[PDB]
């Protein structure tokens, strides 16, 4: 099985978008998460892009694990 497909699929959104849906994008979900962690009061587009680059570099480094 794949984790996020199939008959018994897991939710990709449930722990950062929550159980009451309506947040439209991942940038708006991550800005609210940075606000609740107390590191930015109101996240701008450079604050969220800096988090998106650091996510994508780490996720691409999984393919080089020895």
């Amino acid at each position: 099985l794949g984790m996020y497909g199939g008959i018994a699929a897991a939710s990709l959104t449930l722990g950062i978008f929550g159980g009451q849906a309506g947040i439209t994008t991942w940038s708006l979900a991550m800005a609210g998460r940075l606000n609740a962690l107390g590191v930015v009061q109101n996240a701008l587009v450079d604050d969220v892009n800096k988090l998106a680059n650091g996510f994508n570099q780490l996720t691409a480094s999984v393919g080089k694990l020895a």
Binding site: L37, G38, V39, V40, Q41
Partner: protein, 66 residues
């Protein structure tokens, strides 16, 4: 990654008399980087900005305010 050491305080009051106008930080912390004035930062990151309406909360005098 990198830290800075600032001054901090639970709240700020105008005068020594009981019944003075006092403020505490709204969703953040009162910080001062060895300055002559006080600023606002998020609680988990040093990102200072000057004190404003809709940045503080008017309260009564608590214990050990500056």
């Amino acid at each position: 990654n990198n830290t800075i050491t600032v001054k901090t305080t639970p709240g700020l009051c105008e005068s020594d008399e009981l019944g003075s106008k006092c403020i505490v930080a709204k969703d953040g912390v009162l910080v001062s980087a060895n300055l002559s004035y006080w600023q606002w930062s998020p609680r988990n990151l040093y990102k200072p900005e000057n004190l404003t309406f809709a940045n503080v909360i008017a309260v009564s005098r608590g214990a050990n305010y500056t």
